[PDB]
Amino acid sequence: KLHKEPATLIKAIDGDTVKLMYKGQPMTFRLLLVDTPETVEKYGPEASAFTKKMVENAKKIEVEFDKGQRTDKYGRGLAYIYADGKMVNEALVRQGLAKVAYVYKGNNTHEQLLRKSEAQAKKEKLNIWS
């Protein structure tokens, strides 16, 4: 089973990338299973503002690595980020500011949860889906 770990926000980079102090070392995390528009694509600065706002306002940030590979080729940590118990990954998708990404190297624990949310956002024609 997965487990959450504390992290401290250092700097939010964009819709799907955040910089945190993980285990005393600063590190960039790439949010698992989400594809936000590049900051400029339509809805890119909105997804960035959202991610940024969600993490800067949180009293507690926690990271959760999946069962697959924990870093990508650029050295970015691959995880689910929690801001005061709320998973940022899911929050983005539910708000229609991100598409569910293809599973990477066995990291699929929350793909169903995210798929559901995305369906709902499509249904409500939210942002990316309007």
Please check whether residue 79 is in contact with residue 11, taking contact to mean a CB–CB distance below 8 angstroms: no
Please check whether residue 38 is in contact with residue 45, taking contact to mean a CB–CB distance below 8 angstroms: no
16 in a labelled binding site:
yes
Q: How far does the chain reach from its first CA to its final CA, in angstroms?
A: 36
**Which residues have C-beta within 8 Å of that of residue 53, sequence separation ≥ 6?**
none
Please check whether residue 35 is in contact with residue 83, taking contact to mean a CB–CB distance below 8 angstroms: no
Q: Which of 46, 64, 76, 90 is catalytic?
A: 76
- Does the active-site annotation cover 76? yes
35 in a labelled binding site:
yes
Q: Which of 30, 90, 94, 118 is catalytic?
A: 30
Binding residues are: 16, 35-36
Known binding-site residue numbers for Ca(2+)? 16, 35-36
Active-site residue set = 30, 38, 76
